[PDB]
Amino acid sequence: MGMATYAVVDLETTGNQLDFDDIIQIGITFVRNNQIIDTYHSMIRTNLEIPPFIQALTSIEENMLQQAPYFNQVAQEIYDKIKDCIFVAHNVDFDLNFIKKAFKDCNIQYRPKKVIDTLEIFKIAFPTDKSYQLSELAEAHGITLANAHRADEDAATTAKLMILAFEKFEKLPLDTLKQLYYLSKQLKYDLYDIFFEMVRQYDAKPLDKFYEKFEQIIYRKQVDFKKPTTNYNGSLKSLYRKAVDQLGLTYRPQQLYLAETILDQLMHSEKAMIEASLGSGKSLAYLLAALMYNIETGKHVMISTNTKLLQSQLLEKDIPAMNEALNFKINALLIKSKSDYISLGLISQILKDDTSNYEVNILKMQLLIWITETPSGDIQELNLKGGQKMYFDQKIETYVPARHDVHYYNFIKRNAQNIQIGITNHAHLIHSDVENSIYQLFDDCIVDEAHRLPDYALNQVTNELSYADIKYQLGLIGKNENEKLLKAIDQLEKQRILEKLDIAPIDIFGLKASMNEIHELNEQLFSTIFTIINDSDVYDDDIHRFHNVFTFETKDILKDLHAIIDKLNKTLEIFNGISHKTVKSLRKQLLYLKDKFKNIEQSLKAGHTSFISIKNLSQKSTIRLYVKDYAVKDVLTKQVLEKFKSLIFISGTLKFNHSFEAFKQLFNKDVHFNTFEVQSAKNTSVFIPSDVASYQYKNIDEYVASIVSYIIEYTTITSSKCLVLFTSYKMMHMVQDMLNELPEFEDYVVLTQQQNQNYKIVQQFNNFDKAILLGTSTFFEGFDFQANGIKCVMIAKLPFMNKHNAKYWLMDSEFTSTFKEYVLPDAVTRFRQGLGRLIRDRGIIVSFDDRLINSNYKNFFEQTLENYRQKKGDIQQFGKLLRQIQK
DNA sequence: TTTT
DNA sequence: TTTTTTT
Ligand SMILES: [Ca+2]
Ligand SMILES: [Ca+2]
């Protein structure tokens, strides 16, 4: 047969309604033998009003169209070009249907022989990609998009990206044969005949790169590390000097001093705390301090970071830089927890043919291909979202490992005699021994940005009951004889009555009813929970808010748990002679559900500090009930302090009232803790406006008005970039709209706080030299800032946490004076992290909150300004000063 | 999510 | 013995 031809089709349209919209541009790229042979592109004219939204999107305007044909002209042309091809397009559903109707209105019956959806092929072939949006996908794969949203290019990109995947689908038939039989259950589009054609026209050859077929799974043999080559007999200084010289960096005394500090504390197995608040130097500091510790003693150093950008700059920027200083080739490994690695027990998921969620079938195909690639086996690097992550998190939670399972976690175990630098995240470090065993693998660790460590303790200390999780679990049992487990039990009982299996009698009808009675006892619970949620503080905010409610009795909820737990055990007792796999897995499922409820009931029967949560007031389908099963002070000490010989704490903000006591208090027994600490100060200037009235939310409008007035004053005196740290949503949007209205900020682009691609806002902010400013919320720490000229930071108010903050809710039981011991030291450290970032060039700071001057605790706040120059007065003294700095 |  | 909504 003539090799099939592929029509990769793209349509720009006026809308999404199949019956109410027209094609306004069709681009086609044709493909055969993994190669482009022809392309088709013709703007299509529509007598409809193209709404402005499609114009900013498609770059297409109405005046362009009046010279393009209507669709019925080219209609016979297009059909005659695509009639005998295979139809291909991203979200083919949307594409094919539109061109199917447009052909119908020209008396043309398009019934294509074979349909292909690249969204499926891309999900399988590129399973580690963060998004499958055709634009960003093309960017992650060295594909140049000359222009975005054009169909003649969206059709080429979608065709090129196809040709990669088709060439990537060229490995081993034992694996390709897996995907043929898995492709069938795709139950979406005709793709099997593609693999069926690569099986026929296949060329057999072994490959040693990929390892043996563990069971049936084929994978890539992780490559271990070897003995490190570190020949250096100098001192830490001579290394530093050479290093700073070789990299073309500037010598810094305190940095290298810091470096000698860290080595000294390790060699002696000590426990320091180092508030540095330095610049980029800290990154190289650790590296050389840890690199030295190994050359001298041969021990290993874990580096637990807070974020990824910190972990990366030191992993892939400052490591190949350091490895030019010599033939160093040091070893750094991103050591995560044990659960976050693959056990190659996915053969069990593979054996789960009953899986019909489709999304999982893709995961089955994703895992099969990801596993011949990943050098680490880190699950998260396979970005997992929605249902997929929920099933895979569910299977991994109850996985009963086998005697000889090839687990990717054990690569860390058998190879940390050779990683001089191991790097982690604080959230992994504090997991339980069974969850995370790094204390048994690394004896020496340096926690970075350690003031956020108790905040990470707060999420590993609470357990949760999720309406969503319970709903999914019930879903995996079924409520009728046509649903997963219940459907299988049917075949079992059927096979007792028909195939005569040695199974005992099973009341499938009773179980089905029994299972429906469970479904109602659950809803009944989330109603008693829900109504006291609807009967509480209602916050009306465009951003969906987490209305965490804290006041409630726990008797009626405890009576609905005792009801639902007792019936689960009764449904289990129908099955005691459980020798069959299906009825075994069914019991394991029903049993795990019983433990989720039993654990919360066991936490609420006792009286553990407990609270409810919800995500939407209208959607009762997102209720979550939380309980405090452990104590943070306990979690920190045992999982970290007690289980580490040399533990060096270092952060930009670790000192309160000049006393680390406000940090060591959580470490009970307060075992001896060595203390430590280490131009910009005077290059900076603070201004406390006096005209500003006090913070009164009752009347938040004249406060934001005084803020825009200063933003007005600054922006007109000197157009350097600005930064207004905000702690409130209402207030941040109030000034962001008040900025966009006044014409003084014409030629000025304001940026709000958006979680999606938040980093992008920073990119655009630097993209301009003097036309940018931005309000934000609790984002002080991460941000760095650079420009030409003056530098301003405006803090709206002292960053206190309300008594309605769950962080406070979970911590109140754990402190005597929850204000003096916790929320005040947190407010200060957060406050002094906006400041720390500003100082660098010269700059100023503006603190609008007058609590800093006329409050009893003002002392602790003005302590963070001892090295600056404070001043107070009108917006007039602010103007003169703003001119004074330029002088 | 992922296509206008 | 002092305080208001993100990450
Ligand atoms: Ca399309
Ligand atoms: Ca397009």
Tab-separated table of C-alpha atoms in Angstrom, chain A residues 27-301:
chain	number	residue	atom	x	y	z
A	27	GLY	CA	-3.541	26.239	7.618
A	28	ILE	CA	-2.563	22.729	6.560
A	29	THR	CA	0.787	20.937	6.630
A	30	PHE	CA	1.061	17.541	4.936
A	31	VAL	CA	3.408	14.779	6.110
A	32	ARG	CA	4.651	11.478	4.693
A	33	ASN	CA	7.634	9.383	5.819
A	34	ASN	CA	8.258	11.831	8.687
A	35	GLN	CA	8.710	14.649	6.162
A	36	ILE	CA	6.687	17.663	5.024
A	37	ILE	CA	5.596	17.424	1.390
A	38	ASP	CA	2.981	20.167	0.965
A	39	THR	CA	1.432	23.084	2.887
A	40	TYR	CA	-1.956	24.851	2.447
A	41	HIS	CA	-2.908	28.295	3.856
A	42	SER	CA	-5.872	30.535	2.921
A	43	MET	CA	-7.493	33.227	5.104
A	44	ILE	CA	-11.282	32.573	5.123
A	45	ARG	CA	-13.738	35.511	4.960
A	46	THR	CA	-16.647	35.658	7.485
A	47	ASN	CA	-19.518	38.198	7.251
A	48	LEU	CA	-19.611	37.921	11.055
A	49	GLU	CA	-18.349	40.439	13.592
A	50	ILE	CA	-14.936	39.192	14.743
A	51	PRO	CA	-15.003	40.153	18.447
A	52	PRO	CA	-11.938	42.048	19.690
A	53	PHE	CA	-10.844	39.056	21.775
A	54	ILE	CA	-10.173	36.864	18.737
A	55	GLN	CA	-8.278	39.764	17.124
A	56	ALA	CA	-5.752	40.260	19.925
A	57	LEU	CA	-5.441	36.463	19.950
A	58	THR	CA	-5.276	35.588	16.252
A	59	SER	CA	-3.497	38.782	15.094
A	60	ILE	CA	-6.352	38.772	12.541
A	61	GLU	CA	-8.435	41.877	11.839
A	62	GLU	CA	-11.569	42.335	9.764
A	63	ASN	CA	-10.083	44.594	7.078
A	64	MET	CA	-7.625	41.830	6.141
A	65	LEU	CA	-10.448	39.434	5.320
A	66	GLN	CA	-12.362	41.358	2.647
A	67	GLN	CA	-9.953	40.011	0.004
A	68	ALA	CA	-9.906	36.386	1.202
A	69	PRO	CA	-12.420	33.917	-0.278
A	70	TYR	CA	-15.399	32.528	1.552
A	71	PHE	CA	-15.151	28.891	2.600
A	72	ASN	CA	-17.406	27.476	-0.133
A	73	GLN	CA	-15.012	28.656	-2.849
A	74	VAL	CA	-11.926	26.698	-1.695
A	75	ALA	CA	-14.159	23.961	-0.291
A	76	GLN	CA	-13.774	21.552	-3.207
A	77	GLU	CA	-10.065	22.380	-3.380
A	78	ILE	CA	-9.547	21.576	0.309
A	79	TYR	CA	-11.595	18.362	0.219
A	80	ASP	CA	-9.680	17.139	-2.839
A	81	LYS	CA	-6.467	17.802	-0.872
A	82	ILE	CA	-7.560	16.130	2.387
A	83	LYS	CA	-10.179	13.591	1.267
A	84	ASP	CA	-7.760	10.632	1.242
A	85	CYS	CA	-5.324	11.695	3.980
A	86	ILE	CA	-5.325	11.051	7.745
A	87	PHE	CA	-6.804	13.917	9.742
A	88	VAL	CA	-4.439	15.321	12.375
A	89	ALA	CA	-4.804	18.314	14.722
A	90	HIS	CA	-4.387	19.417	18.376
A	91	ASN	CA	-7.698	18.720	20.176
A	92	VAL	CA	-8.937	17.162	16.898
A	93	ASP	CA	-12.429	17.200	18.464
A	94	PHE	CA	-12.623	20.993	18.167
A	95	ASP	CA	-10.843	21.136	14.801
A	96	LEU	CA	-12.448	18.233	12.948
A	97	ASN	CA	-16.009	19.128	13.961
A	98	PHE	CA	-15.714	22.700	12.676
A	99	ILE	CA	-14.302	21.736	9.275
A	100	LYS	CA	-16.879	18.928	9.236
A	101	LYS	CA	-19.786	21.370	9.523
A	102	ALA	CA	-18.294	23.928	7.122
A	103	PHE	CA	-17.992	21.143	4.553
A	104	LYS	CA	-21.596	20.158	5.302
A	105	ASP	CA	-22.898	23.632	4.379
A	106	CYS	CA	-21.356	23.285	0.905
A	107	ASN	CA	-23.032	19.919	0.171
A	108	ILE	CA	-19.817	18.079	0.964
A	109	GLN	CA	-19.797	14.930	3.102
A	110	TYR	CA	-16.407	14.724	4.806
A	111	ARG	CA	-16.144	11.316	6.471
A	112	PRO	CA	-12.398	10.837	6.929
A	113	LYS	CA	-10.879	7.383	6.949
A	114	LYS	CA	-8.611	7.905	9.969
A	115	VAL	CA	-8.347	10.540	12.708
A	116	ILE	CA	-5.314	11.522	14.811
A	117	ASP	CA	-5.023	13.868	17.813
A	118	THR	CA	-1.563	15.252	18.576
A	119	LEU	CA	-2.611	16.182	22.119
A	120	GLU	CA	-2.616	12.453	22.837
A	121	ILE	CA	0.642	11.761	20.969
A	122	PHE	CA	2.384	14.662	22.728
A	123	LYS	CA	1.184	13.644	26.203
A	124	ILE	CA	2.651	10.178	25.620
A	125	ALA	CA	5.850	11.111	23.789
A	126	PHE	CA	6.823	14.105	25.965
A	127	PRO	CA	5.483	13.020	29.368
A	128	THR	CA	7.864	15.229	31.388
A	129	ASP	CA	6.834	18.506	29.724
A	130	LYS	CA	5.216	21.104	31.963
A	131	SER	CA	2.530	22.061	29.446
A	132	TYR	CA	1.210	20.665	26.181
A	133	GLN	CA	0.187	24.066	24.839
A	134	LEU	CA	1.348	24.075	21.204
A	135	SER	CA	3.164	27.382	21.743
A	136	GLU	CA	5.205	26.471	24.832
A	137	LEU	CA	5.645	22.889	23.617
A	138	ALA	CA	7.333	24.143	20.443
A	139	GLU	CA	9.577	26.269	22.666
A	140	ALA	CA	10.679	23.369	24.876
A	141	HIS	CA	11.845	21.468	21.758
A	142	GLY	CA	14.040	23.927	19.853
A	143	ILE	CA	11.220	24.727	17.388
A	144	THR	CA	11.197	28.386	16.214
A	145	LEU	CA	7.689	29.953	16.084
A	146	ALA	CA	8.239	32.854	13.628
A	147	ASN	CA	4.809	34.235	14.688
A	148	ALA	CA	2.318	32.939	17.304
A	149	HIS	CA	-1.351	31.925	16.655
A	150	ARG	CA	-0.872	31.913	12.834
A	151	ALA	CA	-2.366	28.761	11.320
A	152	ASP	CA	0.217	28.286	8.553
A	153	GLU	CA	2.809	28.099	11.365
A	154	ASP	CA	0.653	26.370	13.981
A	155	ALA	CA	0.152	23.725	11.293
A	156	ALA	CA	3.898	23.393	10.647
A	157	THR	CA	4.798	23.348	14.353
A	158	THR	CA	2.129	20.728	15.055
A	159	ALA	CA	3.469	18.716	12.108
A	160	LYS	CA	7.137	19.102	13.075
A	161	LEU	CA	6.504	18.199	16.734
A	162	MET	CA	4.688	15.161	15.352
A	163	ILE	CA	7.755	14.077	13.367
A	164	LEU	CA	9.867	14.172	16.537
A	165	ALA	CA	7.424	11.908	18.398
A	166	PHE	CA	7.132	9.545	15.428
A	167	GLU	CA	10.932	9.276	15.377
A	168	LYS	CA	11.006	8.947	19.174
A	169	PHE	CA	8.568	6.037	18.719
A	170	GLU	CA	11.449	3.871	17.527
A	171	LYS	CA	12.796	1.756	20.383
A	172	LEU	CA	11.960	-1.872	21.160
A	173	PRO	CA	9.009	-3.968	19.894
A	174	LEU	CA	8.428	-5.575	23.297
A	175	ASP	CA	7.710	-1.995	24.416
A	176	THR	CA	6.001	-0.895	21.199
A	177	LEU	CA	3.774	-3.986	21.416
A	178	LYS	CA	2.767	-2.822	24.897
A	179	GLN	CA	1.584	0.477	23.426
A	180	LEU	CA	-0.399	-1.089	20.586
A	181	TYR	CA	-2.480	-3.070	23.078
A	182	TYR	CA	-2.636	-0.042	25.382
A	183	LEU	CA	-3.426	2.319	22.491
A	184	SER	CA	-6.583	0.296	21.804
A	185	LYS	CA	-8.031	1.287	25.208
A	186	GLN	CA	-7.427	4.908	24.120
A	187	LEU	CA	-11.110	4.642	23.065
A	188	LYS	CA	-10.695	8.138	21.531
A	189	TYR	CA	-9.148	8.134	18.020
A	190	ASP	CA	-7.590	5.761	15.426
A	191	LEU	CA	-3.854	5.622	16.367
A	192	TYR	CA	-3.258	1.894	16.755
A	193	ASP	CA	-2.714	1.472	12.996
A	194	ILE	CA	0.347	3.687	13.409
A	195	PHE	CA	2.032	1.327	15.877
A	196	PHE	CA	0.627	-1.614	13.947
A	197	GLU	CA	2.583	-0.263	10.979
A	198	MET	CA	5.773	0.191	13.001
A	199	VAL	CA	5.531	-3.410	14.237
A	200	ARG	CA	5.251	-4.798	10.699
A	201	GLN	CA	7.951	-2.587	9.179
A	202	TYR	CA	10.255	-3.101	12.149
A	203	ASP	CA	13.960	-3.927	12.304
A	204	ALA	CA	15.097	-6.173	15.161
A	205	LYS	CA	18.280	-5.315	17.105
A	206	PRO	CA	19.227	-5.479	20.805
A	207	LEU	CA	20.330	-2.414	22.750
A	208	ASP	CA	22.549	-2.415	25.842
A	209	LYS	CA	21.952	1.258	26.777
A	210	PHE	CA	18.413	0.428	28.009
A	211	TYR	CA	18.652	-2.188	30.787
A	212	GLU	CA	17.081	-5.692	30.907
A	213	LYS	CA	13.295	-6.205	30.757
A	214	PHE	CA	12.697	-6.101	34.540
A	215	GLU	CA	9.601	-8.334	34.568
A	216	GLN	CA	8.172	-6.945	31.286
A	217	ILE	CA	9.101	-3.259	31.808
A	218	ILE	CA	12.112	-1.995	29.818
A	219	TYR	CA	14.105	0.935	31.206
A	220	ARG	CA	17.386	2.918	31.259
A	221	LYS	CA	20.217	1.702	33.516
A	222	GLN	CA	20.907	4.536	35.917
A	223	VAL	CA	24.586	5.472	35.695
A	224	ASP	CA	26.257	5.546	39.105
A	225	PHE	CA	28.995	7.879	40.333
A	226	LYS	CA	32.578	6.883	41.099
A	227	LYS	CA	35.272	7.894	43.603
A	228	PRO	CA	35.794	11.710	43.541
A	229	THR	CA	39.158	13.131	42.310
A	230	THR	CA	39.959	16.053	44.678
A	231	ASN	CA	43.689	16.889	44.883
A	232	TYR	CA	44.019	20.181	46.756
A	233	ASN	CA	46.432	20.727	49.647
A	234	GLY	CA	46.001	24.478	50.068
A	235	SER	CA	43.859	26.341	52.560
A	236	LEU	CA	40.291	27.539	52.123
A	237	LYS	CA	41.583	31.018	51.256
A	238	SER	CA	43.969	30.079	48.429
A	239	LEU	CA	41.148	28.042	46.880
A	240	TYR	CA	38.732	30.988	47.208
A	241	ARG	CA	41.215	33.478	45.691
A	242	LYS	CA	42.014	31.132	42.761
A	243	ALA	CA	38.295	30.417	42.373
A	244	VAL	CA	37.227	34.081	42.375
A	245	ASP	CA	40.024	34.816	39.887
A	246	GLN	CA	39.254	31.913	37.548
A	247	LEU	CA	35.526	32.698	37.372
A	248	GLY	CA	36.142	36.390	36.725
A	249	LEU	CA	34.296	37.284	39.939
A	250	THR	CA	34.996	40.025	42.518
A	251	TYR	CA	36.826	39.060	45.770
A	252	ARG	CA	34.644	39.462	48.913
A	253	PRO	CA	36.222	39.125	52.418
A	254	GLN	CA	33.027	38.371	54.422
A	255	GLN	CA	32.006	35.755	51.785
A	256	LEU	CA	35.286	33.792	52.099
A	257	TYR	CA	35.106	34.420	55.869
A	258	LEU	CA	31.609	32.894	55.796
A	259	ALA	CA	33.178	30.046	53.867
A	260	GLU	CA	35.850	29.399	56.516
A	261	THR	CA	33.139	29.650	59.177
A	262	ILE	CA	31.128	26.800	57.656
A	263	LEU	CA	34.135	24.490	57.263
A	264	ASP	CA	35.242	25.088	60.854
A	265	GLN	CA	31.772	24.299	62.223
A	266	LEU	CA	31.540	21.050	60.232
A	267	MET	CA	34.997	19.609	60.936
A	268	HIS	CA	33.995	19.931	64.621
A	269	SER	CA	30.458	18.564	64.101
A	270	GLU	CA	28.858	21.783	65.444
A	271	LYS	CA	25.431	23.506	65.377
A	272	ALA	CA	25.524	27.131	64.196
A	273	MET	CA	23.051	29.817	63.125
A	274	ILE	CA	24.302	32.343	60.565
A	275	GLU	CA	22.146	35.363	59.677
A	276	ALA	CA	24.005	36.636	56.560
A	277	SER	CA	21.495	38.369	54.232
A	278	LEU	CA	24.447	38.545	51.763
A	279	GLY	CA	24.195	38.547	47.924
A	280	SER	CA	24.938	35.821	45.327
A	281	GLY	CA	28.130	35.000	47.300
A	282	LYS	CA	26.325	32.618	49.704
A	283	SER	CA	25.809	30.120	46.823
A	284	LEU	CA	29.545	29.707	46.033
A	285	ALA	CA	30.282	29.998	49.785
A	286	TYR	CA	28.513	26.736	50.615
A	287	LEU	CA	30.062	24.935	47.641
A	288	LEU	CA	33.650	25.703	48.634
A	289	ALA	CA	32.937	25.163	52.336
A	290	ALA	CA	31.448	21.742	51.531
A	291	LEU	CA	34.031	20.935	48.840
A	292	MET	CA	36.785	21.595	51.382
A	293	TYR	CA	35.131	19.476	54.096
A	294	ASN	CA	35.391	16.438	51.823
A	295	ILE	CA	39.010	16.908	50.711
A	296	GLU	CA	40.108	17.202	54.330
A	297	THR	CA	37.939	14.472	55.915
A	298	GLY	CA	36.041	12.592	53.200
A	299	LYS	CA	32.579	13.201	54.693
A	300	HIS	CA	29.422	14.378	52.831
A	301	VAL	CA	27.322	17.577	53.176
